[PDB]
Amino acid sequence: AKHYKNNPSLITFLCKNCSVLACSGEDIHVIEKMHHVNMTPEFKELYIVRENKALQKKCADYQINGEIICKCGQAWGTMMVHKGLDLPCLKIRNFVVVFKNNSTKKQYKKWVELPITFPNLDYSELEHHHHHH
Ligand SMILES: [Zn+2]
Known part of the structure; x- marks a missing residue:
């Protein structure tokens, strides 16, 4: 991670x-150095939440209430909820990543494999974040 680019604007994610x-x-x-999410309102117009009892469960810091899928049907991730706040969690294996100006397409199995550093919010920062931003 120390040689990663802390410039997320360089990439775009396409449904695989x-x-x-x-x-x-x-x-x-x-989120809490683990979950990669997209909490923007615009993103919510692009996915569907469906039931998936294999993935749903109650955890200490969140509950998983369903699976998030693309309008085309391709699974994208899971719907986590922390203290009533939606955390649409993306699994990188469901996307194609495009880097700008070089426009080269890539696929990864784990987020750590993508050499980009993203902003972090610990669970303890989520209520404040949603209240203000
Ligand atoms: Zn799709």
Whole structure:
């Protein structure tokens, strides 16, 4: 991570199945150094939440209430909820990542494999973040 670029605007995420633009890297936050989410209102117009009892569960710091999928049907991630706040969690394996100016397409299995550093919000910062921003 020390040689990563802390410039998320360099990348865009496309659904690996239908190629639709899911979001810019600028719309991603990492939560408690683990979960990569997109909490913007615009992103909510692009996914559907469906039931998936294999993935739903109650955790100490969040609950998983469903699976997030693209309008085309391709799974994208999970719907986490922390203290009533929605955390749409993206699994990088469901997307194609495009880097600007070089426009080269890439696929990854884990977020740590993508050499980009994103802004972090610990769980303890979420209520404040949603109240103000
Ligand atoms: Zn799709």
